[PDB]
Amino acid sequence: SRCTHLENRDFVTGTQGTTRVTLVLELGGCVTITAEGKPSMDVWLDAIYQENPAKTREYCLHAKLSDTKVAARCPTMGPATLAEEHQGGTVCKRDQSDRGWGNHCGLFGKGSIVACVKAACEAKKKATGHVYDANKIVYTVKVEPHTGDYVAANETHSGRKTASFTISSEKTILTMGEYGDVSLLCRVASGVDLAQTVILELDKTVEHLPTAWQVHRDWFNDLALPWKHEGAQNWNNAERLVEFGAPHAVKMDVYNLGDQTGVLLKALAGVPVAHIEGTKYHLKSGHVTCEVGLEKLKMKGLTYTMCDKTKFTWKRAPTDSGHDTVVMEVTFSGTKPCRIPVRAVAHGSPDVNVAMLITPNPTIENNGGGFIEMQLPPGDNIIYVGELSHQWFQK
Amino acid sequence: ILELDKTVEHLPTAWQVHRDWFNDLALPWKHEGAQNWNNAERLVEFGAP
Amino acid sequence: ENPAKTREYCLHAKLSDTKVAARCPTMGPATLAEEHQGGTVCKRDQSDR
Amino acid sequence: ENPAKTREYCLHAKLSDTKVAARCPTMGPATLAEEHQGGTVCKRDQSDR
């Protein structure tokens, strides 16, 4: 059962008459649903994402400066000017330098000086923000029936089904193989509010970093870095990463404040990560409430005869699942298919069956069955699968 | 005298800093000539397994 | 000219050859030869199995 | 019959292939490949030179 793979697992149980079940599925969680006369089902919210979300601003973390130009005039010669002062994509500073005979001016005094640099951004040194549209966000829910077959996490359960939901398409009917149909009504509106969320992306090809972060819109909009719209050619406020030195005669130095990535990363510690897979921008945390309709589900193998009580052996002896249940797997050497005669008694009371089965109507099919998950009361018990027995101390 | 990469064009080639400040930098360090870095973990983080 | 160098600090780590070793609950401690080599950064922890 | 074995302890160590590496005061850290191998016991110290 898929839910046995994780630590975060909930059990939902429907009694007599319970045909519908309302669950709050959370990313990283898993729910096992059990109900009288119904095959058990594992359900979980698998992903929350939007393909190609809209991009808000792009910020530059490392300025690439080039073509530094300086123009200086002697004290009586008027303002110094450069064509660059009027071009976008350049950062300039006008100042005054001390001039005199030493640097070829007729008078000793203040002379006009102006320096400009072309400012661009280093390749792969942008920080881009993305915003979600509640109407385009997709919630993916997976359902897997309890078939008495154990499948590891790196393996694929042939009976697992997937359902996708958007605000405009909240209901799906899934056919669970021979178990019947299950209906899922999940409301995206009951999900995570995304108004103040921005998915921040740096360079997703960097190997030792998460591919994205989920940050607050107000924090993102206040970053003190050069910015522009995707598609725009030049950067606004490029001066944020450039400093000019005090001028001396006909020269003025231009300083680059360096790569701000390290600075940003310190700010991002403790911020939740997100994930990008191609064009899909995923949230790594979130939840949604769904209504599961069980009325069309039917159990499998109810009319088989009981398996020969003499032909069972333990493939995997009873073991603690970590969810206060016991898991085990048996092998049957008799004729299939048949119902597995499972029960358990408390040490000293051989007459009362104390086993509460999670796995519905355990059966050995022609090519499956054998895995059983059950709950037992605290203390010493003995598990029986026909004549096959096993001691079990619960707790 | 602190030196970074003196070949970088838009930066001073060196700074005059206080010895106590320099000795307290929270960065991996080593002696010139040494092959490995001490305290390299200062620039590395491990995720929950 | 050529003043004596004190420490060198690293401003940007270059990481490579990430290796992981994990053992099931009854199989004892996980170990890597790298844990004993200089020039490597390691973290030992516990995962749910 | 054949109960499970927990730890094995060693009551008498068999030591062999003692190796020492020493460096003068300006030559940096002394190192041995053995410091990184399992199955060796090492001690780093400082001697008067």
Q: Is C34 in contact with C15 (CB distance < 8 Å)?
A: no
Cβ partners under 8 Å of residue A134, min gap 6? A167, A188, A189, A194
Closest by CA position to A23, among listed A8, A48, A52, A44 = A44
Phi-psi region of A315 (alpha: psi -120 to 50; beta: other; left: phi over 0): alpha
Q: Is the C-alpha dihedral spanning C3, C4, C5, C6 positive or negative? A: negative
Burial class (CB in 10 A: 0-12, 13-18, 19+), A245: middle
Q: Is A217 in contact with A196 (CB distance < 8 Å)?
A: yes
Instruction: Spell out the long-range contacts of A95-98 with Cβ–Cβ below 8 A and sequence spacing 24 or more.
Output: A95/A244, A95/A246, A95/A247, A95/A252, A96/A247, A97/A72, A97/A247, A97/A248, A97/A249, A97/A250, A97/A252, A98/A248, A98/A249
The method of structure determination was cryo-EM
CA dihedral B20, B23, B26, B27 (to 10 degrees): 150
Please, what is the end-to-end C-alpha distance for chain C in angstroms?
60
DSSP 8-state assignment for residue C46: -
Query: Cα-flanking dihedrals φ and ψ of residue D12, to 5°?
Result: -145, 110
What's the resolution in A?
24.0
Closest by CA position to A345, among listed A377, A306, A382 = A382
Please write down the HEC assignment for all residues of A163-197: EEEECCECEEEEECHHHEEEEEEEEHHHCCCCCCE
Query: Cα-flanking dihedrals φ and ψ of residue A229, to 5°?
Result: -90, 150
User: Which of A213, A256, A261, A268 best probes binding to B when mutated, by most B CB atoms within 10 angstroms?
Assistant: A256
Q: Is the C-alpha dihedral spanning A324, A321, A367, A32 positive or negative? A: positive
Distance CA A223, CA D34 (A): 51
Distance CA C10, CA B44 (A): 12
Phi-psi region of A249 (alpha: psi -120 to 50; beta: other; left: phi over 0): left
CA atoms lying within 13 Å on the CB side of residue D13: 5
- Domains of chain A in start order, with CATH, are 1-51+135-191+272-299 (2.60.98.10), 52-62+122-134+192-235+257-271 (3.30.67.10), 63-121+236-256 (3.30.387.10), 300-395 (2.60.40.350)
Q: Is the C-alpha dihedral spanning A326, A356, A343, A338 positive or negative? A: negative
| Neighboring chains of D (3 or more beta-carbon pairs < 8 A) | B, C
Q: Is A272 in contact with A214 (CB distance < 8 Å)?
A: yes
In chain C, residues 1-49 whose CB comes closer than 8 Å to chain A = 12, 15, 48
C/B Cβ contact: 3+ pairs below 8 Å: yes
For the record, the structure tokens of A20 come out as 């519908």
Distance CA A347, CA C29 (A): 37
CB contact under 8 A, C37 and D36: yes
CB contact under 8 A, C36 and D31: no
Closest by CA position to A329, among listed A337, A321, A32, A155 = A321
Give the Cβ contact number of residue A130 at 10 Å. 19
User: Which of A61, A208, A320, A323 best probes binding to C when mutated, by most C CB atoms within 10 angstroms?
Assistant: A208
